[PDB]
Design a binder for these strands. Structure first.
Length: 73
DNA sequence: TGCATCCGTGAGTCGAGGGTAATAACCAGGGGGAGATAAACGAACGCTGAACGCTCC
């Protein structure tokens, strides 16, 4: 997700918040590796922050998901 | 102590002119302001004439 109005190092720090979230909600009772669980939370934190901090005029999160959806189609 | 290196600064004058890119995507819940219907008063009207006077027989 580099090169979209957010600095590359800034993306790492916001994703880093997602990682600390994931460890508090992870356990061995599920028969799966930590890597599969973590990547969901990493992607969530990065994409939400990108929605909330890239544009000069802030756009609400649900308008942002509308425009990128229509752009791709 | 001398020699080598790099970093910062400055480099004319007025004229002419405007727009830039890219990636899991959702229920689920739920709060919070922005637009839709009955109650408190007093002011137009309303007939209520009643109650006063203004001319007339």
């Amino acid at each position: 997700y580099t090169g979209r109005g957010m600095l590359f190092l800034d993306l790492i720090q916001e994703g880093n918040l997602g990682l600390i979230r994931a460890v508090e909600k992870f356990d061995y009772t599920k028969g799966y590796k930590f890597s599969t669980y973590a990547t969901w939370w990493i992607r969530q934190a990065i994409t939400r922050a990108m929605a909330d901090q890239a544009r000069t005029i802030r756009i609400p999160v649900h308008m942002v998901e509308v425009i990128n959806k229509l752009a791709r189609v």
